[PDB]
């Protein structure tokens, strides 16, 4: 059966559902018996032909630790695929957006502050998410955790129509032009924040193309009636986060410390 280091150490309990990188499985450790959420990633999805480089990125991620960052425990190999062993957790912030439609400034602030705390910590360690979306933020009582943080530089994601439209709402203009740094995570969080409050994308459209054209221009509005009774401070934050030029865009620490976040903390 020539099984890998994974099958000897773990055996799958059940399928958790399709993820952005492949199948997501619920696994038990064969010795300790603790349960983990394991992402099976086809080796062809590797972005770097030198596997050791990828094992090094992941190693750096394993050493990291923050309350709002999903823990990555280890990486294992088959002949065919990688296995990312991470935290088991139970729904997405996306599902909560559907349910509540909109969030009060107070409830939104508590949620996004935790998002900022996580981003800040990862950015201190030069790690950029690049694919921040409500689908990548998990919640139940109050606690948020950002998943797959840093994995997108190692592995290529699914890019079906459904994947591409979702990516399109949150992507920073520079990322389209072909470059990214930490500031693209602040843009993406800004779009999320805009959605938390209005229940509406800042950059909208009936298809992938139309959305991306509006992102490209960087033009958006606080014109919807829904914005009429939202605070100047909240609008200020979003303005600084959706600043066109990344160099002129506010940092993650500056988000964490904006007067709007402090008012509801």
Q: Residue 43's domain spans which residues?
A: 2-90
Resolution (A): 2.5
**Backbone phi, then psi, for 77, in 5-degree steps?**
-130, 140
Residue 80, annotated as binding a ligand: yes
Domain match, 167 and 204 both:
yes
Judge whether 78 is annotated as a binding position.
yes
DSSP letter (8 states) at residue 29: E
**Residue 7 sits in the same domain as residue 22:** yes
Q: Which residues contact 24 (CB under 8 A, 6 or more apart)?
A: 15, 16, 17, 18, 37, 38, 39, 40
How far CA 164 is from CA of 57, 92, 112, 141, 170, in Å, comes to 25, 18, 24, 31, 11
**After which residues does the chain become discontinuous at a C–N distance over 2.5 Å?**
90, 139
- 9 lies in the same domain as 124: no
Question: HSE of 3 in the Cβ direction (CA atoms, 13 Å)?
Answer: 8
Asked if residues 199 and 261 have their Cβ atoms less than 8 Å apart, the reply is: no
Q: Is 188 annotated as a binding residue?
A: no
Q: Which residue among 90, 124, 157 closes a domain? A: 90
Q: Which two tokens stand for residue 185?
A: 């995570």
Where in the sequence numbering do the catalytic residues fall? 131
The contacts of residue 21 (CB under 8 Å, 6+ apart) are 39, 41, 45, 84, 148, 151, 155, 157, 158
Last residue in a domain, options 59, 90, 121: 90
Distance CA 75, CA 84 (A): 5
Q: Which of 41, 63, 90 is the last residue of a domain?
A: 90
Rounded Cα gap, residues 51 and 233, in angstroms: 46
Method: X-ray
Q: Does residue 189 contact residue 205 with C-beta atoms inside 8 Å?
A: no
Do 79 and 187 belong to one domain? no
Residue 71 annotated as binding site:
no
Domains identified in the chain, total number: 2
Q: Do both 61 and 129 map to the same domain? A: no
Give one DSSP letter per residue of 131-161, joined into a string. ---GGGEE---S--EE-STTGGGTB----SH
Residue 246, CA distances (Å) to 130, 153, 160 in order: 13, 19, 28
Residue 101 exposed, middle or buried by CB count within 10 Å (0-12, 13-18, 19+): exposed
Please tell me the total number of residues recorded for the chain in this structure: 265
What is the Cα–Cα distance from 16 to 37, expressed in whole angstroms? 8
11 with 54, same domain: the answer is yes
Alpha carbons 174 and 100: distance in angstroms, whole number = 32
Using DSSP, state whether 38 is helix, strand or coil.
strand
Report the chain's C-alpha Rg in angstroms: 19
Residue 3 CA to residue 11 CA, distance in Å, equals: 11
Q: Are 144 and 68 in contact (CB under 8 A)?
A: yes
Annotated binding-site residue? 232? no
* CATH classification of the domain holding 72: 3.30.200.20
In angstroms, the CA 173 to CA 215 distance is 6
Q: How far apart are CA 86 and CA 74, in angstroms?
A: 7
- Let me know: does 185 contact 132? Beta carbons within 8 Å: yes
């Amino acid at each position: 059966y020539f099984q890998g280091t994974f099958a000897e150490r773990y055996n799958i309990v059940c399928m958790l559902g399709k993820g952005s990188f492949g199948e997501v499985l619920k696994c038990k450790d064969r010795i300790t018996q603790q349960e983990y959420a394991v992402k099976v990633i086809n080796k062809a999805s590797a972005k770097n032909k030198d596997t050791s480089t990828i094992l090094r990125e992941v190693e750096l991620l394993k050493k990291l630790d923050h309350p709002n960052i999903m823990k990555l425990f280890e990486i294992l190999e088959d002949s065919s695929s990688f296995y990312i062993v991470g935290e088991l957790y139970t729904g997405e912030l996306f599902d909560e957006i559907i349910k509540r439609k909109r969030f009060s400034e107070h409830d939104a602030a508590r949620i996004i502050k935790q998002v900022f705390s996580g981003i800040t910590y990862m950015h201190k360690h030069n790690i950029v998410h690049r694919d921040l979306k409500p689908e990548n933020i998990l919640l139940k009582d109050c606690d948020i955790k950002i998943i797959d943080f840093g994995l997108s530089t190692c592995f290529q994601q699914n890019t079906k129509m459904k994947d591409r439209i979702g990516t399109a709402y949150y992507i920073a203009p520079e990322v389209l032009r072909g470059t990214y740094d930490e500031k693209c995570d602040v843009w993406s969080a800004g779009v999320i924040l805009y959605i938390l409050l209005s229940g509406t994308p800042p950059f909208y459209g009936k298809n992938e193309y139309d959305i991306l054209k509006r992102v490209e221009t960087g033009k958006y509005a606080f014109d919807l009636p829904q914005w009429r009774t939202i605070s100047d401070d909240a609008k200020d934050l979003i303005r600084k986060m959706l600043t066109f030029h990344p160099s002129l865009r506010i940092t993650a620490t500056q988000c964490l410390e904006h007067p709007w976040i402090q008012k509801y903390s």
